[model samples]
Target chain A: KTKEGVVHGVATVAEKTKEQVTNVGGAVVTGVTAVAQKTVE
Target chain B: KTKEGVVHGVATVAEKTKEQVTNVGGAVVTGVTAVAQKTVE
Candidate 1:
């Protein structure tokens, strides 16, 4: 009963963590793109 | 002649890049905090 609620909360937190990691992922992509373009020019 | 203008633009971009990097940094901090708290509990 209460254990299921705990699981639901954890799953929601995990989703937030996933979103945070994805933000970092895209940031790295943009960083590398900036460096590559700067160096190429 | 135009090199100074290039440097100005680069400095602006570098500032934006720093903001992006800081965003990722905070994101990772939050992620680690979530994981630590979840695991500890």
Candidate 2:
């Protein structure tokens, strides 16, 4: 299934996961992965 | 000595250092290195 993504100014992994879970309206069942920040030229 | 690495959403150097210094119970003695972000498919 495709998941919707949201951009957040997260200060911690916990906060990031919380946002994802709450947005989906389900109990978070998997570990959150950190996406490396990217710089555009 | 080997140093432990932690993933932190650091807004500033002070906050990042605080986490590392506090986590390992060591006085942080060196500057923190920032990792450049990467983009991938």
Candidate 3:
């Protein structure tokens, strides 16, 4: 059976938004994978 | 006419407070859009 993947980080609400922007910016700049995940039920 | 922009999302207090947890959960999320906005002087 495949195990569940987890991603965790620490940041404030504004900081989180900024980090997201940075991640997307980096992805666009370096052509890296853009991370996306759905909230588990 | 100057066009104003807006962002909207629905999330639980826990979810919104998750990222912000690393900072301060001292604030409450009584509503979805609990953020405050300022106008141009």
- The candidate maximizing lDDT is 2
lDDT of 2 by residue, B1-41 (tens): 32123244443212322121122232333334445556344
**Alpha-carbon runs more than 4 Å astray in model 1:** A1-19, A22-41, B1-5, B10-41
lDDT of 3 by residue, A1-41 (tens): 33344334433232222222122112222112222333232
Q: Which ten residues in a row have the lowest lDDT in candidate 1 chain A?
A: A5-14
Q: Give candidate 2's root-mean-square deviation (CA, Å).
A: 17.1
Tens digits of per-residue lDDT for model 1, A1-41: 11111111111111111121244343332221121112111
What is the lDDT, from 0 to 100, of the residue A11 in candidate 3? 32
lDDT of each: 0.22, 0.33, 0.29
Error of 2 at A32 (Å): 21
* Best of the candidates, DockQ: 2
* Two-chain DockQ for model 2: 0.07
**Tens-place lDDT digits, model 1, residues B1-41:** 11211111221122212222334333233111111122111
Cα miss at A27, model 3 (Å)? 36
- Native contacts retained by model 2, as a fraction? 0.10
> Model 3: DockQ against the native?
0.02
- By descending lDDT, how would the candidates be arranged? 2, 3, 1
The full ranking of all candidates by DockQ, starting with the best, is 2, 1, 3
Misplaced by over 4 Å in model 2 are A1-35, A38-41, B1-10, B13-29
